[PDB]
Ligand code: HEM
Ligand code: HEM
C-alpha cells in the first residue's frame with residue numbers, strides 16, 4: 001500500500017511506503033485519533049523475532065543481507081538468547097541502532113543531523129561513580145566550549161528489570177525548583193519534585209533561582225547516589241536583549257547543553273534504560289516553553305510590564321509581543337557567546353529538506369505534526385503546511401516511568 | 412473504552428465516553444496516525460434516520476414515547492415509499508446546531524446553541540437562492556454586531572438536482588494572475604476568479620474586489636449575481652501606533668461565511684448550506700495576509716518597521732506578524748465589528764470543552780486545527796490533550812462543483 005502527503009503551500013506530494021515496515025501501535029483506531037495525547041521484561045519467546053528483524057535491517061544497511069556473516073550472526077544471537085535469555089550487541093550494531101532510534105524519532109525536528117552522532121559505549125560501567133565519570137566526559141565532549149556536538153552515552157541494558165541502570169534526572173543539566181510556604185516557587189517549577197528527592201538524598205541546596213541540580217545515578221539496580229557536575233563543565237549563557245538594556249537586569253540565564261536522560265533506547269528488543277543523549281537547543285524551547293509557560297519561569301508579565309505594554313486586555317497582544325522579545329533575547333545571547341543554537345525558521349526549513357530527502361532515499365519519514373510545529377509562529381514556518389504521517393519504527397526512544405515510582409529501596 | 416484527556420498546564424483530567432457513539436471514521440489506524448492530513452439507498456437511510464431521531468427525542472426527554480415511535484414509523488413509511496424523507500422544522504434546527512456542536516475543528520463552539528437557522532427548503536431557482544443569501548448576509552452582519560446563522564437549501568435527491576454555492580465563502584476577494592507574472596488580489600481565488608470571468612463577470616481588476624456569487628439550483632448551470640455592496644461590511648486596516656500602516660491600503664470583510672460544505676442530518680445531505688459567524692483575528696492577520704500563497708505582505712511590513720531582515724534569527728517575520736495581528740483586532744474593534752482574539756477564543760473553548768465533558772461526556776476536538784497559527788503555547792489549548800472523532804449530524808467537505816457539474 002502507498003500513502004501520499006501533500007504540502008499545501010508548495011503543492012509537493014510525496015509517497016510513503018516506509019509505514020509498511022511499522023511495528024508498534026499509535027494509540028489511534030479507525031474511530032479515534034489520539035494524535036495530541038502526550039503518552040498514548042521480555043522472554044526469548046518475543047526476543048528472537050525482534051533480534052532477527054533488527055539484524056536484517058542492520059545487514060541491509062551495510063549491503064551484506066543474506067551473506068555468510070549475516071547468517072552466522074543470526075545463529076550466534078539465536079544461540080545466545082536460548083542460552084542466556086538475552087544477547088549482546090556488537091559495537092557497530094550499537095552505533096547503527098542508536099543513530100536509527102534518532103532517525104526514527106517522529107517528534108524530533110532536528111533529525112537532519114541523525115547520521116552525525118557520537119556514540120559512547122558505556123556498557124562496561126558497573127557503579128554510579130563509573131556512571132558519573134562517563135557523564136562528565138559526555139558533557140565535556142558535547143559542550144566543546146560552545147561548539148556543540150551531538151552525542152549519546154549508552155549504559156548496560158536491562159536484564160531481569162531488577163538490576164536497572166537509571167539516571168534519575170530528566171536532563172543532565174537542569175535548574176532546581178523550590179516551592180515556598182507562600183505557594184510561590186523559586187527557580188524552575190518543572191523540577192520541584194525532583195529537587196525534593198535530591199534534598200532528601202542529602203543535597204545541600206543553595207536555594208537560588210538558577211542552581212544546577214546534582215546528578216542522581218542508579219547502577220545495577222542499586223539505590224541512586226548524588227554527584228555534583230563540576231561547574232567548569234556546565235556552560236551557561238546570561239540572557240540579554242540587543243536593544244533593551246533592562247533585559248539583563250531580569251537576572252536570567254540558561255545552560256547551553258540540552259541532554260535528555262530519562263528515555264529508553266530499544267534496539268533489537270534490548271532495553272537501554274539509561275542512554276542520556278544531547279544535541280543543541282532550538283531557541284523556542286528556552287524562550288517560549290522554559291521562560292513563558294505559565295507552569296515554568298513565566299516571565300511574560302515582568303517583561304511586558306517593563307516594555308510598558310497595555311496589559312489591561314489580551315486583545316492588545318501584549319503576551320504575544322513580550323514572547324517575541326524574549327525569544328530574540330535568547331538567540332542574541334547564545335550567538336553573541338558563540339554557543340550553538342538554532343532558531344525555529346531555520347530548524348523547520350532544514351527539517352522539510354530532511355523529510356523530502358527521507359521520502360526519496362528511504363520511502364518515508366515518520367513525523368508528529370503536533371510536536372514538529374514550533375510553539376510560536378506556527379504558520380510562518382514551512383512545517384505548518386506540511387501533511388505528515390505518524391508511525392513507529394524500531395530502533396526507538398520510548399518513555400519509561402519515573403524511577404522513584406518504581407524503585408525497590410535496598411536502604 | 413473510557414478515555415482520559417489531561418491538561419498539562421493545569422493537571423485537569425477529563426474522562427471521555429462520548430467517543431463510543433462515534434459513527435464515521437478518522438483516517439487513522441492502529442499503525443498510522445493521519446491527524447495532520449487535511450482530507451482523510453433505502454437500506455443505508457433508515458438506520459441513519461433512526462439513529463438521528465433517537466438522539467432527537469432523547470434531547471427533548473421523550474425517548475421511547477408514543478410521539479417518538481410514531482415519528483420513527485412515519486419516517487420509515489416515507490422512506491419505504493419515497494426513498495427519502497423530510498425533516499420537521501424542529502429536527503432541522505436540532506440537526507444544524509448539532510452539526511456545529513460536533514465540528515471538531517471549530518474553536519468557536521461555545522456559541523453552538525445560539526444559531527439562527529433559515530429554512531430555504533422551498534427554494535427552486537438561483538434567483539431564489541440569491542434572495543435567501545442576501546437576507547442571510549444582512550441578518551448576520553447586523554451593522555457590525557455579528558450573529559451566527561446558516562441557510563439550508565433543498566436536500567440532495569438523485570444527485571442530479573443539486574443545489575450548490577460555487578463560492579467557497581459568500582464574501583471573498585478576487586484573484587488575477589498578471590502579465591507581469593505575479594498575482595493581483597488574493598491568490599487563493601485565482602482559478603475561481605477566472606471561472607466567474609469565463610461566465611461573464613466584468614472584474615473591476617483591483618486588489619479587494621468582492622467576488623460575484625455563482626449559484627446553482629436544482630442541478631442547473633450556475634448564475635452570476637453581485638451582492639449589493641451596501642450588504643458587504645468592510646474594515647479598513649490600521650495600526651494603533653504605526654500611522655504608515657494604513658498606507659499599505661489593507662481592508663478585510665467582516666463576515667466569514669463558509670459556503671462550500673455539505674451538511675449531513677439523519678442520512679440526508681444538504682449540499683448548499685452557507686453558514687457564518689465571525690472572525691478570530693489570526694484568520695485574517697496570520698493566514699489571509701501572511702501565508703506565502705495568500706496576500707503575503709510580511710516582507711513589506713517588516714521593511715516599514717525598519718527591522719533587520721538580514722537573518723531569520725532576528726525574528727523579523729515574528730515581530731511583523733504580531734503588529735499585523737494587533738492592527739486587525741484594533742481596526743475591527745474600533746469600527747464595532749465583532750471579532751475575537753485567539754487568547755479569548757481558546758480560553759472560551761477550554762470552558763466549552765469542560766462544559767461538554769460534564770454535560771455530554773466529551774467533546775470531539777482536532778488539536779491541529781484548534782491551536783491558533785501563532786502564539787500556540789501561550790494559549791491554553793496548546794497544553795490540552797484532545798480526542799478527535801466523527802459524530803453525526805456533521806459538516807463534511809465535498810468536491811468543487813466545477814469538477815462534477817455537467818454543462
Ligand atoms: C542536534 C540538535 C537537535 C535539535 C535542535 C533537536 C530539536 C528537538 C526539539 C525542538 C524537540 C521537541 C522538544 C520538546 O518540545 O520538548 C525534539 C524532540 C526529540 N528529539 Fe531532537 N533535536 C536535536 C538532536 C537530537 C538527538 C541527538 C536525539 C537523540 C539522539 C534527539 C531525539 C529526540 C527525541 C527522542 C524527541 C522526543 C522527546 C519526547 O518524545 O518527549 N534529538 N528534538
Ligand atoms: C461564532 C463565531 C465563530 C468563530 C470565532 C469560529 C472559529 C473557527 C475557526 C478559527 C476555524 C478554523 C478555520 C480555518 O483555519 O480555516 C473554524 C472551523 C470550523 N468552524 Fe467555527 N467558528 C465560529 C462559528 C461557526 C459556526 C456558526 C459554524 C457552523 C454552524 C462553524 C463550523 C466550523 C466548521 C465546519 C469548521 C472547519 C471546517 C473544516 O473541517 O475545514 N463555526 N471555526
Ligand SMILES: N=C(Nc1cccc(-c2cccc(NC(=N)c3cccs3)c2)c1)c1cccs1
Nearest residue numbers: 038039110258259260277278279280281282285
Ligand atoms: N515534557 C516532555 N518531554 C520533554 C521535556 C523536556 C525536554 C524534552 C526534550 C526531548 C528531546 C529533545 C529536546 N530538546 C533538544 N534540543 C535536545 C535534547 C537532547 C538532544 S536535543 C527536549 C522533552 C514530555 C513527553 C511526554 C509527556 S511530557
Ligand SMILES: N=C(Nc1cccc(-c2cccc(NC(=N)c3cccs3)c2)c1)c1cccs1
Nearest residue numbers: 449450667668669686687688689690691694808
Ligand atoms: N482551508 C480549508 N478550508 C477552509 C478555507 C477557508 C475558510 C475555512 C473556514 C471554515 C470554517 C470557519 C472559518 N472561519 C470562521 N471564523 C467562520 C466561517 C464561518 C462561520 S465562522 C473558516 C476553511 C481546507 C480544508 C481542506 C482542504 S483546504
Ligand SMILES: C[C@H](O)[C@H](O)[C@H]1CNc2nc(N)[nH]c(=O)c2N1
Nearest residue numbers: 384385386387447448449779780
Ligand atoms: C497540513 C496541515 O494539517 C494544515 O496546514 C493545517 C494545519 N492546521 C490548520 N489549522 C487551522 N485552524 N486551519 C488550517 O487551515 C490549518 N491547516
Ligand SMILES: C[C@H](O)[C@H](O)[C@H]1CNc2nc(N)[nH]c(=O)c2N1
Nearest residue numbers: 036037038370371793794795796
Ligand atoms: C497536549 C499536547 O500534545 C502537548 O501539550 C504537547 C503539544 N505539542 C508539543 N510540542 C513540543 N515540541 N513539545 C511539547 O512539549 C508539546 N506539548
Ligand SMILES: [Zn+2]
Nearest residue numbers: 028033439444
Ligand atoms: Zn491519529
